[PDB]
């Protein structure tokens, strides 16, 4: 977590009731007394005695420190890795289908190219023996 105005962890986390943004009481008392109760970043007017509220952290549950080995962190890592791998698979299938579609087009145009090159080979051939016969006959 980060405080908004100071960019750190607030010693006394106080919540703006109007917008729900995390503040620190001393810096925002400074801000309101030097800006006439103007919320930072917005045009809203904030009330320190009614529109501001601190944070109470009950310590009933034994607090697990935020480490990556923990099960909430591990399941967030699992769903993030699943997100990345599924989007990679989805992309790969997208240009795979694109490549297969232009592959079908490429195979059909290769068949057409084979047809026209057979036709042009036969045409060039019959032209060549026609020229040969004409040169033989024209003595």
């Amino acid at each position: 977590m980060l405080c908004a105005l100071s960019g750190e962890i607030p010693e006394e986390p106080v919540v703006s009731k109007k917008t729900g943004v995390l503040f620190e009481k001393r810096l925002i008392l400074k801000y309101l007394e030097e800006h006439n109760n103007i919320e930072p970043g917005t045009t809203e007017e904030l009330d320190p005695e009614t529109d501001l509220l601190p944070i109470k952290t009950s310590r009933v549950v034994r607090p697990r420190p935020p480490n990556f080995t923990s099960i909430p962190s591990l399941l967030k890592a699992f769903q993030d890795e699943w997100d990345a791998l599924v989007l990679e698979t989805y992309t790969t299938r997208e240009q795979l289908a694109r490549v297969r579609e232009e592959l079908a087009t490429a195979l059909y145009q290769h068949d057409a190219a084979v047809r026209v090159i057979a036709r042009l080979t036969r045409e060039r051939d019959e032209a060549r023996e026609a020229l040969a016969r004409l040169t033989v006959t024209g003595a």
Binding site: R59, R62, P63, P65, N67, A97, R100, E101, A104, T105, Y108, Q109, A112, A113, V114, R115, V116, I117, A118, T121
Partner: protein
């Protein structure tokens, strides 16, 4: 512009090109027109691997000269092919055809590129899987050595910051236990 654009579209191709074997296969092709097509294709692979060296490709490959041509008659040839177009197949039809191909030869079989449609030899299939598995296992211990070396490097880089976290967690646990004892004492003392 003289060079082909089909290999300019990267789509990782072979670094090694055998002009002799390719020309031998092209000459051994029984169809004359397709034989000429494969021969000029072999010349094209020789030209590509000669004047465009891939990383890992051997250098000093000899290029092959090609007679010059004109783009107008190139467009004329393309117009001949375009008027020899039949009806284009539907993308759903192509997808169904390739899905039937996948079902006949599953994802591993189509993933292995050594499975031609004429290769019914079980021994040749086993040999292909054996060669592919040997190359795969080569990749396994190469990437395993790389990953183990990098993990050891980052371990020796970050273990100093790793050691602090356990002590800080222990201090947090002691603090929470002391806080629970203090609040229980607070309630008990204030009532009494």
């Amino acid at each position: 512009r003289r060079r082909t654009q089909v290999m300019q579209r990267e789509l990782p191709r072979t670094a090694v090109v055998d002009i002799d074997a390719l020309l031998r296969a092209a000459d051994e092709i029984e169809d004359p027109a397709r034989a000429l097509v494969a021969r000029e294709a072999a010349l094209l692979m020789a030209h590509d691997a000669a004047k465009y060296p891939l990383p890992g490709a051997p250098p000093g490959v000899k290029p092959v000269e090609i007679p010059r041509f004109s783009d107008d008659e190139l467009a004329e040839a393309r117009l001949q092919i375009l008027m020899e177009m039949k009806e284009k197949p539907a993308p759903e039809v192509v997808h169904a055809i390739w899905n039937r191909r996948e079902e006949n030869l599953n994802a591993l079989r189509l993933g292995l590129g050594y499975y031609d449609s004429d290769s019914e030899d079980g021994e040749d299939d086993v040999a292909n899987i054996r060669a592919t598995l040997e190359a795969a296992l080569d990749r396994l211990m190469a990437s395993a050595e790389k990953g183990n070396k990098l993990e050891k490097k980052l371990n020796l880089h970050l273990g100093g910051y790793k050691n602090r976290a356990e002590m800080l967690r222990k201090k947090l646990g002691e603090a929470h236990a002391a806080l629970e004892k203090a609040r229980n004492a607070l309630a008990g003392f204030q009532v009494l």
